Amino acid sequence: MPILLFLIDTSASMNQRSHLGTTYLDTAKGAVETFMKLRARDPASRGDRYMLVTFEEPPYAIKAGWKENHATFMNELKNLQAEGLTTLGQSLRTAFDLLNLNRLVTGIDNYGQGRNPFFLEPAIIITITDGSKLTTTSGVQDELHLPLNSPLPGSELTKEPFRWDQRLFALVLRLPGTMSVESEQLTGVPLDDSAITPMCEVTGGRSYSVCSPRMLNQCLESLVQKVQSGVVINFEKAGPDPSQPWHSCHKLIYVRPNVPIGHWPVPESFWPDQNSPTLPPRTSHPVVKFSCTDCEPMVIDKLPFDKYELEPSPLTQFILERKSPQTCWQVYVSNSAKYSELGHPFGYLKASTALNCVNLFVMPYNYPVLLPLLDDLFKVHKPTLKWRQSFESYLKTMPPYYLGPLKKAVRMMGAPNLIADSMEYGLSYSVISYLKKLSQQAKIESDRVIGSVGKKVVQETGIKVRSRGFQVALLNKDLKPQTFRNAYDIPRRNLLDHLTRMRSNLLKSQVHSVPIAQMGNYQEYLKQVPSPLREL
């Protein structure tokens, strides 16, 4: 089930009137409710988690996180106040930490054991902001820099705050003070030009620059269309053409569940060795490189293979323009082989037979040398030692993390007691110990942060009278005047009326300030009320 985390700008520049007469924060809140209405139109959103992060201090920044119901999310979305600074980088860091703190305790990341596209927790961050400058109480910044000062344990394993299955979308509000007459506003929404745009584009998302309520509704419909379950894969051109924009793209592949099922991982960017104590940091988007030279899709019977449909992109448009579903484009990550820096093809990009979509087929690590070999044994053979010395030659090049999936695949294929069923060494004992300790600390800040989102942050202010430690109290919002219990709370202007009311209350001879949402409780008031009789 998806996670919808809203990074609402609560900087004071959000108190800007539009031609609508409401502030940018009011437009932000209304954009969130309209997004949730359009999302609830989709009946697949019966299970959907909404999270709220503001620009405030990290004790107060996360307003709704994990284990917060719909009512708390709405009651805290309504009560937002734009009284802060434009601390976009710190807020983005806190939002990514709120997305990623559970990853090491539940092991979605699968560090050092291959990148599993079916191991995903699909989340998108919709930040609603304006084009104002970023401020950090010392000046303007004019460039977005996420701080790395208090790293979550295990943050160095990915080298980027965002993850595989996270996309940052910016809804930049640029509603002017006076309404602008425009007939070209029905066209496509332009990309914004603020500092949030490159950070949105590097995570596989995009920034929306609205200038009118109808443009806002168009962007919200587009954002509803982009709530998918998948992981972002960086595609690159390896060889020459068979720079044009299809050369590089941080596109999205689709992971459709049935819980998702899958067998083969996207290979790591390194060769695993037990000598290295520290696991190498991998990019959050696996840089795959497709071969532009045409090849042939190689599928045998009963074969566990995973097919991932790419989202529409310039790469898929380029592939479908060269209309040839009978061929395929081999893809591989660099520096994955033990010796060759180029690597072996772990899969191919094949257009659909209907010329509709481009599917990424992930395979075992070197499928053009395993599928003919394994197909040869399952066509002819009881393995022969002439085959087994060739199979050992393949296993000498296969990365160690593929051994488990290969064992499971040949077990469900019909050859349980194959060589792949013999032993599994895996990673280095330092790496397993480090990952287990990281899981324990991830649990520690997991129960630290979740306990601190609500009822753990109360703010009280003072005037702090200067000398040229005394302070002057303020009119507190939760004053709660106990006027019937404390005589100091009674104003002089109504001292006599309150006095005779207290006298009437104590002798034998506030209320009706219910907070609006509960004053019209149709079901709640009749439930406490007794039931009447029924009809004849």
């Binding site: 520049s13 800007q16 009284e83 802060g84 400058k133 000046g139 003070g177 006076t178 202010t461």
Partner: protein
């Protein structure tokens, strides 16, 4: 009414740490070049040096809101000096009365954050109202913003002319 000689006299007063006299003669030069700040002061008279020295003079007279207003007179707005001066709590220049002269949304955002941090709820409400003006919207079509900046420049400089002479 020779503006260059008035600038020279203001610079001489600034060199001898006579900051009120320096502001007096800088504003006299600016009133000479315009018609008592009815036109824009030409940029070869209020250069960046002259506006920076007026900023320094207003800082050393503890007129920090005037420093914040004069920081946005520059070609690029000096947010560092404006944010440093707005943090000061010994001001002699009618702090919230000068918020009408601030047309930059970033400075008003900092003012709102600063008044919220210190619990100055009334000045925070004044700053929020100042941000909540349709003419001060940053997405205004670049000529409404320029005219708002120019009229606030005229009003502020006439207020300084009244204050210093």
């Amino acid at each position: 009414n020779n503006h260059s000689w008035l600038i020279i006299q203001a610079d001489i007063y600034f060199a001898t740490n006579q900051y009120s006299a320096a502001l007096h003669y800088y504003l006299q030069a600016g009133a000479v070049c315009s018609d008592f700040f009815n036109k824009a002061v030409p940029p070869d008279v209020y250069t960046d040096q002259v506006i920076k020295r007026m900023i320094k003079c207003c800082s050393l007279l503890n007129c920090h809101t005037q420093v914040a207003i004069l920081c946005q007179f520059l070609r690029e707005i000096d947010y560092k000096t404006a944010f440093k001066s707005l943090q000061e709590q010994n001001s002699h220049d009618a702090m919230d009365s000068y918020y009408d002269y601030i047309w930059d949304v970033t400075i008003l955002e900092y003012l709102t954050y600063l008044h919220h941090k210190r619990g100055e709820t009334d000045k925070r409400q004044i700053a929020i109202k100042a941000i909540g003006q349709t003419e001060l919207n940053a997405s205004n079509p670049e000529e409404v913003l320029q005219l708002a900046a120019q009229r606030r420049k005229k009003k502020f400089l006439q207020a300084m002319a009244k204050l210093y002479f």
